[PDB]
Amino acid sequence: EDAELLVTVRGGRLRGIRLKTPGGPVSAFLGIPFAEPPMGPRRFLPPEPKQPWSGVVDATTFQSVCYQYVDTLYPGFEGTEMWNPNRELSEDCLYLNVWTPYPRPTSPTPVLVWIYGGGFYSGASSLDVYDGRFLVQAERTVLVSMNYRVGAFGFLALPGSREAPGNVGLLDQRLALQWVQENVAAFGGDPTSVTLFGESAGAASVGMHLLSPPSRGLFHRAVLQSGAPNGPWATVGMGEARRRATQLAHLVGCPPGGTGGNDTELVACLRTRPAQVLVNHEWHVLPQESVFRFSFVPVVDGDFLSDTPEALINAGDFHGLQVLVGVVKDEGSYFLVYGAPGFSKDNESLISRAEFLAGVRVGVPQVSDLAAEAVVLHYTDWLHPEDPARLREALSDVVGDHNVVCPVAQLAGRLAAQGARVYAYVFEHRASTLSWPLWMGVPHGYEIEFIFGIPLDPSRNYTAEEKIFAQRLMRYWANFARTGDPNEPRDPKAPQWPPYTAGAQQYVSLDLRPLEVRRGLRAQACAFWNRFLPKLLSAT
Amino acid sequence: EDAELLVTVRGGRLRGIRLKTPGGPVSAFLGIPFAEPPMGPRRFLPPEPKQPWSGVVDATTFQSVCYQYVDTLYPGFEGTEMWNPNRELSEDCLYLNVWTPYPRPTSPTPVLVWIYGGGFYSGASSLDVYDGRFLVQAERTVLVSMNYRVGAFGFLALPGSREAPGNVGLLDQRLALQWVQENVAAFGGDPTSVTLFGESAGAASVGMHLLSPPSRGLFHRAVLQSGAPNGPWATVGMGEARRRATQLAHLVGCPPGGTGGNDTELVACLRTRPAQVLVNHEWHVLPQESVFRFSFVPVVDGDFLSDTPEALINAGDFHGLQVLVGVVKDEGSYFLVYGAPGFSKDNESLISRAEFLAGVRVGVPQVSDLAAEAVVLHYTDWLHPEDPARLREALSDVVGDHNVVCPVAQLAGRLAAQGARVYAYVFEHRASTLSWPLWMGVPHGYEIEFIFGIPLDPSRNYTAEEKIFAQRLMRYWANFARTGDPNEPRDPKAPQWPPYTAGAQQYVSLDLRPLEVRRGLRAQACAFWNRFLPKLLSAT
Ligand SMILES: NC(=O)c1cc[n+](CCCn2ccnc2/C=N/O)cc1
Ligand SMILES: NC(=O)c1cc[n+](CCCn2ccnc2/C=N/O)cc1
């Protein structure tokens, strides 16, 4: 066997598996049940801890993916299907994974906890791009990742009722963090040095745990990659969440006409429907034709979030907190092929002036015609108002700034100015093996493979420079997980990474070149979104 | 006895004077009466042609300056005194001047006609900086300049009535243009090649003559320096012009206590007041505290201007017309010492953030608080939002773009796209003898001394490069007056001046260095004023 592939946790015994890397082996415990399967009468309900089990639970392979929509925009395409489920779908999906170095650390080791993205409607901890064997081997860290319910199963909310309170997907993540506090020591991990890190919707989830008191005590550092809780997509109002849950119920025949109405009968009817039936009508509850908008997201209910994320961020005291935030160079390009007219991954997407004006309404839905004109003014080069190439990158900036860059910059500034230690970055390396078209540049989500050391995989065709670049990034993330500072603790050889402040607004660029310090995360563009445009929407 | 100093015109005989230049003599005829003195019952009335005279009218010195306010912001300061009247004030001021080379041209010579600026409240053709002896000697053209009524005497308007119809100051300029058609041949000038050029309010006057059919037939080319007829200061509505005229009457005691206040009784009472009394209350009729706003300006009445200047520019056909437009580098800095808080010509004017916010309301009066927010958003460097130096240059840009640069670019683009050949420039050389503080850069109005060849005056302390630079500009202006093209017709050696088009938007920089082609007259900033802000005011 291996003596270290057998571990006892509070619920029972487990048997892991050894993973091979070019640098050495790693012990992995994949598919650990941390919650009772949220099935039958437990659909839409908060999770319960997994009851203890007899015998040895097999933890040698990833468990099922939570029921979710499957992307079909480009069948057979690597760029889209790398995010699709790689295990079979099931509501029995509340399982987590633990990577630990070999040999097992004898002293408490800092813990990294991954939260996958996917717009709160998709994602899985089993994706190949989340393989934590290279990050754990190269940095001797303990890596944990969990599955959480997405879509209606995780975020359908009838606010007020007990049958569908909403945010149960966030509670799934919290329970996995409580499991980490109670069991990560058995794997050699320090429960007093837990660093959350996630991307997109996962980064937004990490931010909502900062703003939730019960979750705040379960971790000590946070990393938010291309996402923030205060974005225009990460939360939804109580009234709007009720309308979508009612609309989804209507699309699946709930309630049976004309018997029913209240929330008890509505959720009871939803529980009888097969899981695939609810998924098949998920996108048909959104209010508009739009991109970067998702049907079932965290709801501002007063429970998990006592107020809106914007309100909690402004009134928050973040002393004793270290945050690492950042974005990719082209946040909006990935989302333009999902609705913006004239865009296609198979041509160069040289859109016309008319298509640009139409795409602004898709990228910025629910804004007055005056608000859209303010967006057109700010993102139009008036020396070349018709140039298709410039218009293509302009709409990409519109979607990326409105949804990612400016929500992140507003959070990074408020955190630093209110006690938190903040480090900011911009990822500017396009992978040599990237399958998306060249005009997308560095799309959203394609820094993850370098954070997890995927270039080190010998079965892949990365360059030698990308392998060294991946190791330097893993050093940054691990140093931040250990010390709270991505700079190497005793090393001025490489240039330093200065903290991000509300005044200087310093960040570093992450590419093959050495670190380069810059100032302002699109300060002029984000002043339009964060300062002026709210005033324009107030006076309709 | 020099027979060249004796000329007969349609009204009688004149005796001129010989003026000395380092390059040769020039025959000047200063103080030619072109209208009956608009005194007594003729105050506020359109001009009437000067009745023919017997004898020899002496034309050896400048005549009286029209009654106007005298600047007292900095007593004894060269930068302000140079614009103050240098002759006695009088309502008998409708006189013009003619410069002609020696010996007198035997072939019909193109004619330049100068229209001074001064916010329609001041100015005079007798100012030292308007001396035409150097431009006429170096380029052998015929230069004409006239006095026109300013302030209430030229632009007080009770629209509809016949006693104070308004725009009589513009009619003074037109009458002088009719005089050029009927008499410039006697001086060797060609009435079929007349080029207008004016600065600030003079440039706005040149623009309004283009938009007036009776004036359009009196000339063939136009030059507009740091001014346009479509600016927010060059015109006023009928209702506002009536309110200002009525309050001026009130401030001087018109009508008397217990007197009917119709237009006839109001003007009759105004005609009894000494001219200085009306001047002493001119600035007390502006609606609010502001800079770059003037009490009595051309009124949009349907007579001289059938519609607003912007409406006439949009619907205008300008085929067969050549226009030379341009601005100085720092159009707004000179006006900031006239009301903007924290500004002083005797310190660095390092204003605070609060003073910048207050100055925007002074530089942009009568705009909603939301409109002011949009101005601050566009002109704030959000990476250095409190830097006093940057805020100083920002408010200078706010005033310069809102009042000069963007009204000119709007005009230049519409002219080129609707039949006119347009040339654009930016004057970027700061005179070595400039008395204004260094932080004003190249202030508004300080390209005039180089256009008129003032550096060639031996009693001045200009540099050798400024003398060559002044000759370049006189050649540019003369080439445009002769051929409609500032480029040298016999030369491919020098850098060429490409026409300004609505698409490429090419202009040249005018300084000691050779010509440099650039694109866009502050295109991003002017799209805010010309495109977005009108949408913001319509939605309030
Ligand atoms: N069933 C459909 O016709 C359908 C429409 C839109 N979507 C949205 C695709 C996901 N998306 C939206 C904006 N950006 C994205 C990409 N996420 O990875 C999915 C399905
Ligand atoms: N008597 C006064 O208090 C008074 C107020 C304003 N002014 C206007 C000054 C001229 N001005 C104002 C803004 N821009 C200008 C242009 N100066 O050339 C003069 C006097």
mmCIF file with all atom_site columns, C-alpha atoms in Angstrom, chain A residues 66-164:
data_model
loop_
_atom_site.group_PDB
_atom_site.id
_atom_site.type_symbol
_atom_site.label_atom_id
_atom_site.label_alt_id
_atom_site.label_comp_id
_atom_site.label_asym_id
_atom_site.label_entity_id
_atom_site.label_seq_id
_atom_site.pdbx_PDB_ins_code
_atom_site.Cartn_x
_atom_site.Cartn_y
_atom_site.Cartn_z
_atom_site.occupancy
_atom_site.B_iso_or_equiv
_atom_site.pdbx_formal_charge
_atom_site.auth_seq_id
_atom_site.auth_comp_id
_atom_site.auth_asym_id
_atom_site.auth_atom_id
_atom_site.pdbx_PDB_model_num
ATOM 1  C CA . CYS A 1 66  ? -23.444 18.843 -9.324  1.00 0.00 ? 66  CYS A CA 1
ATOM 2  C CA . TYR A 1 67  ? -26.358 19.073 -11.755 1.00 0.00 ? 67  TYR A CA 1
ATOM 3  C CA . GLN A 1 68  ? -25.673 21.952 -14.114 1.00 0.00 ? 68  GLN A CA 1
ATOM 4  C CA . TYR A 1 69  ? -26.068 23.245 -17.646 1.00 0.00 ? 69  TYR A CA 1
ATOM 5  C CA . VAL A 1 70  ? -23.656 21.862 -20.252 1.00 0.00 ? 70  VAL A CA 1
ATOM 6  C CA . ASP A 1 71  ? -22.141 24.308 -22.732 1.00 0.00 ? 71  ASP A CA 1
ATOM 7  C CA . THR A 1 72  ? -23.039 23.557 -26.361 1.00 0.00 ? 72  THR A CA 1
ATOM 8  C CA . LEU A 1 73  ? -21.926 26.747 -28.140 1.00 0.00 ? 73  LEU A CA 1
ATOM 9  C CA . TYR A 1 74  ? -18.945 25.038 -29.826 1.00 0.00 ? 74  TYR A CA 1
ATOM 10 C CA . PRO A 1 75  ? -19.284 21.238 -29.677 1.00 0.00 ? 75  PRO A CA 1
ATOM 11 C CA . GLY A 1 76  ? -15.952 19.435 -29.594 1.00 0.00 ? 76  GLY A CA 1
ATOM 12 C CA . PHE A 1 77  ? -14.038 22.663 -28.905 1.00 0.00 ? 77  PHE A CA 1
ATOM 13 C CA . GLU A 1 78  ? -11.282 22.492 -26.295 1.00 0.00 ? 78  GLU A CA 1
ATOM 14 C CA . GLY A 1 79  ? -11.786 26.091 -25.166 1.00 0.00 ? 79  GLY A CA 1
ATOM 15 C CA . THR A 1 80  ? -15.371 25.490 -24.023 1.00 0.00 ? 80  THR A CA 1
ATOM 16 C CA . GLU A 1 81  ? -15.442 21.792 -23.100 1.00 0.00 ? 81  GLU A CA 1
ATOM 17 C CA . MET A 1 82  ? -12.532 22.140 -20.657 1.00 0.00 ? 82  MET A CA 1
ATOM 18 C CA . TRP A 1 83  ? -15.098 23.685 -18.280 1.00 0.00 ? 83  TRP A CA 1
ATOM 19 C CA . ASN A 1 84  ? -17.883 21.158 -18.938 1.00 0.00 ? 84  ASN A CA 1
ATOM 20 C CA . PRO A 1 85  ? -18.523 18.357 -16.416 1.00 0.00 ? 85  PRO A CA 1
ATOM 21 C CA . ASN A 1 86  ? -16.002 15.519 -16.612 1.00 0.00 ? 86  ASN A CA 1
ATOM 22 C CA . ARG A 1 87  ? -17.952 13.310 -14.189 1.00 0.00 ? 87  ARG A CA 1
ATOM 23 C CA . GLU A 1 88  ? -21.592 12.288 -14.396 1.00 0.00 ? 88  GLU A CA 1
ATOM 24 C CA . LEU A 1 89  ? -24.187 14.710 -13.056 1.00 0.00 ? 89  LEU A CA 1
ATOM 25 C CA . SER A 1 90  ? -25.994 14.035 -9.780  1.00 0.00 ? 90  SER A CA 1
ATOM 26 C CA . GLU A 1 91  ? -27.560 15.906 -6.890  1.00 0.00 ? 91  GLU A CA 1
ATOM 27 C CA . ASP A 1 92  ? -25.382 13.641 -4.707  1.00 0.00 ? 92  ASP A CA 1
ATOM 28 C CA . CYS A 1 93  ? -22.365 15.856 -5.294  1.00 0.00 ? 93  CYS A CA 1
ATOM 29 C CA . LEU A 1 94  ? -21.308 17.422 -1.958  1.00 0.00 ? 94  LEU A CA 1
ATOM 30 C CA . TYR A 1 95  ? -17.785 16.006 -1.859  1.00 0.00 ? 95  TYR A CA 1
ATOM 31 C CA . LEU A 1 96  ? -14.409 17.674 -1.341  1.00 0.00 ? 96  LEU A CA 1
ATOM 32 C CA . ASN A 1 97  ? -10.803 16.860 -2.210  1.00 0.00 ? 97  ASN A CA 1
ATOM 33 C CA . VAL A 1 98  ? -7.523  17.129 -0.291  1.00 0.00 ? 98  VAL A CA 1
ATOM 34 C CA . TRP A 1 99  ? -4.022  17.201 -1.791  1.00 0.00 ? 99  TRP A CA 1
ATOM 35 C CA . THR A 1 100 ? -1.100  16.790 0.616   1.00 0.00 ? 100 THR A CA 1
ATOM 36 C CA . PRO A 1 101 ? 2.637   16.482 -0.082  1.00 0.00 ? 101 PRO A CA 1
ATOM 37 C CA . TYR A 1 102 ? 4.652   13.294 0.148   1.00 0.00 ? 102 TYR A CA 1
ATOM 38 C CA . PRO A 1 103 ? 5.919   12.658 2.663   1.00 0.00 ? 103 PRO A CA 1
ATOM 39 C CA . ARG A 1 104 ? 3.057   14.059 4.731   1.00 0.00 ? 104 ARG A CA 1
ATOM 40 C CA . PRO A 1 105 ? 4.069   17.254 6.574   1.00 0.00 ? 105 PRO A CA 1
ATOM 41 C CA . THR A 1 106 ? 4.980   16.504 10.180  1.00 0.00 ? 106 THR A CA 1
ATOM 42 C CA . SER A 1 107 ? 4.427   20.148 11.248  1.00 0.00 ? 107 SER A CA 1
ATOM 43 C CA . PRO A 1 108 ? 1.296   22.220 10.521  1.00 0.00 ? 108 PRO A CA 1
ATOM 44 C CA . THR A 1 109 ? 1.350   23.456 6.900   1.00 0.00 ? 109 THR A CA 1
ATOM 45 C CA . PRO A 1 110 ? -0.678  26.363 5.451   1.00 0.00 ? 110 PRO A CA 1
ATOM 46 C CA . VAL A 1 111 ? -3.839  25.383 3.583   1.00 0.00 ? 111 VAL A CA 1
ATOM 47 C CA . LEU A 1 112 ? -5.108  26.618 0.217   1.00 0.00 ? 112 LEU A CA 1
ATOM 48 C CA . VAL A 1 113 ? -8.838  26.192 -0.450  1.00 0.00 ? 113 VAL A CA 1
ATOM 49 C CA . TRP A 1 114 ? -10.051 26.457 -4.049  1.00 0.00 ? 114 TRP A CA 1
ATOM 50 C CA . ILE A 1 115 ? -13.545 27.584 -5.059  1.00 0.00 ? 115 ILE A CA 1
ATOM 51 C CA . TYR A 1 116 ? -14.265 27.076 -8.748  1.00 0.00 ? 116 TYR A CA 1
ATOM 52 C CA . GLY A 1 117 ? -16.075 29.623 -10.886 1.00 0.00 ? 117 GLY A CA 1
ATOM 53 C CA . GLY A 1 118 ? -18.804 29.236 -13.454 1.00 0.00 ? 118 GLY A CA 1
ATOM 54 C CA . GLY A 1 119 ? -21.301 32.044 -12.930 1.00 0.00 ? 119 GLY A CA 1
ATOM 55 C CA . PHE A 1 120 ? -22.946 30.113 -10.056 1.00 0.00 ? 120 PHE A CA 1
ATOM 56 C CA . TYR A 1 121 ? -24.556 27.882 -12.717 1.00 0.00 ? 121 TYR A CA 1
ATOM 57 C CA . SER A 1 122 ? -21.709 25.469 -13.548 1.00 0.00 ? 122 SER A CA 1
ATOM 58 C CA . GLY A 1 123 ? -18.285 24.269 -12.476 1.00 0.00 ? 123 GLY A CA 1
ATOM 59 C CA . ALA A 1 124 ? -16.717 21.282 -10.757 1.00 0.00 ? 124 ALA A CA 1
ATOM 60 C CA . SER A 1 125 ? -13.679 20.563 -8.606  1.00 0.00 ? 125 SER A CA 1
ATOM 61 C CA . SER A 1 126 ? -12.792 17.606 -10.871 1.00 0.00 ? 126 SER A CA 1
ATOM 62 C CA . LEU A 1 127 ? -11.780 19.674 -13.915 1.00 0.00 ? 127 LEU A CA 1
ATOM 63 C CA . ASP A 1 128 ? -8.315  18.878 -15.264 1.00 0.00 ? 128 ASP A CA 1
ATOM 64 C CA . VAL A 1 129 ? -7.302  22.548 -15.023 1.00 0.00 ? 129 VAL A CA 1
ATOM 65 C CA . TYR A 1 130 ? -7.855  22.414 -11.239 1.00 0.00 ? 130 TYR A CA 1
ATOM 66 C CA . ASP A 1 131 ? -5.441  19.507 -10.683 1.00 0.00 ? 131 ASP A CA 1
ATOM 67 C CA . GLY A 1 132 ? -3.555  20.389 -7.519  1.00 0.00 ? 132 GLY A CA 1
ATOM 68 C CA . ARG A 1 133 ? -0.720  17.878 -7.768  1.00 0.00 ? 133 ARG A CA 1
ATOM 69 C CA . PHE A 1 134 ? 1.778   20.409 -9.147  1.00 0.00 ? 134 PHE A CA 1
ATOM 70 C CA . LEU A 1 135 ? 0.991   23.229 -6.706  1.00 0.00 ? 135 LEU A CA 1
ATOM 71 C CA . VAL A 1 136 ? 1.241   20.874 -3.720  1.00 0.00 ? 136 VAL A CA 1
ATOM 72 C CA . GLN A 1 137 ? 4.459   19.216 -4.905  1.00 0.00 ? 137 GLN A CA 1
ATOM 73 C CA . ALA A 1 138 ? 6.294   22.411 -5.852  1.00 0.00 ? 138 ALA A CA 1
ATOM 74 C CA . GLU A 1 139 ? 5.309   24.418 -2.759  1.00 0.00 ? 139 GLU A CA 1
ATOM 75 C CA . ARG A 1 140 ? 4.553   21.745 -0.106  1.00 0.00 ? 140 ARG A CA 1
ATOM 76 C CA . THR A 1 141 ? 1.148   23.285 0.619   1.00 0.00 ? 141 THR A CA 1
ATOM 77 C CA . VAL A 1 142 ? -2.113  21.554 1.527   1.00 0.00 ? 142 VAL A CA 1
ATOM 78 C CA . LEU A 1 143 ? -4.765  22.145 -1.141  1.00 0.00 ? 143 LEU A CA 1
ATOM 79 C CA . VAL A 1 144 ? -8.489  21.610 -0.546  1.00 0.00 ? 144 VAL A CA 1
ATOM 80 C CA . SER A 1 145 ? -11.323 22.009 -3.049  1.00 0.00 ? 145 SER A CA 1
ATOM 81 C CA . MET A 1 146 ? -15.037 21.303 -2.730  1.00 0.00 ? 146 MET A CA 1
ATOM 82 C CA . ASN A 1 147 ? -18.104 20.948 -4.903  1.00 0.00 ? 147 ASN A CA 1
ATOM 83 C CA . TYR A 1 148 ? -21.018 23.275 -4.205  1.00 0.00 ? 148 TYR A CA 1
ATOM 84 C CA . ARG A 1 149 ? -24.511 23.291 -5.660  1.00 0.00 ? 149 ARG A CA 1
ATOM 85 C CA . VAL A 1 150 ? -24.941 25.584 -8.663  1.00 0.00 ? 150 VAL A CA 1
ATOM 86 C CA . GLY A 1 151 ? -27.939 26.797 -10.623 1.00 0.00 ? 151 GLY A CA 1
ATOM 87 C CA . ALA A 1 152 ? -31.413 26.412 -9.168  1.00 0.00 ? 152 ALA A CA 1
ATOM 88 C CA . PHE A 1 153 ? -30.254 23.606 -6.875  1.00 0.00 ? 153 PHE A CA 1
ATOM 89 C CA . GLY A 1 154 ? -27.825 25.993 -5.202  1.00 0.00 ? 154 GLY A CA 1
ATOM 90 C CA . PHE A 1 155 ? -29.381 29.431 -5.559  1.00 0.00 ? 155 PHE A CA 1
ATOM 91 C CA . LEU A 1 156 ? -33.098 29.245 -6.365  1.00 0.00 ? 156 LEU A CA 1
ATOM 92 C CA . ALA A 1 157 ? -34.521 31.565 -3.719  1.00 0.00 ? 157 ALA A CA 1
ATOM 93 C CA . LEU A 1 158 ? -38.045 32.276 -2.501  1.00 0.00 ? 158 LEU A CA 1
ATOM 94 C CA . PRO A 1 159 ? -36.982 34.822 0.140   1.00 0.00 ? 159 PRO A CA 1
ATOM 95 C CA . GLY A 1 160 ? -38.635 34.449 3.527   1.00 0.00 ? 160 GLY A CA 1
ATOM 96 C CA . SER A 1 161 ? -39.725 30.835 3.180   1.00 0.00 ? 161 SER A CA 1
ATOM 97 C CA . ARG A 1 162 ? -37.978 27.903 4.842   1.00 0.00 ? 162 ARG A CA 1
ATOM 98 C CA . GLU A 1 163 ? -38.322 25.563 1.845   1.00 0.00 ? 163 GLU A CA 1
ATOM 99 C CA . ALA A 1 164 ? -36.085 27.616 -0.490  1.00 0.00 ? 164 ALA A CA 1
#
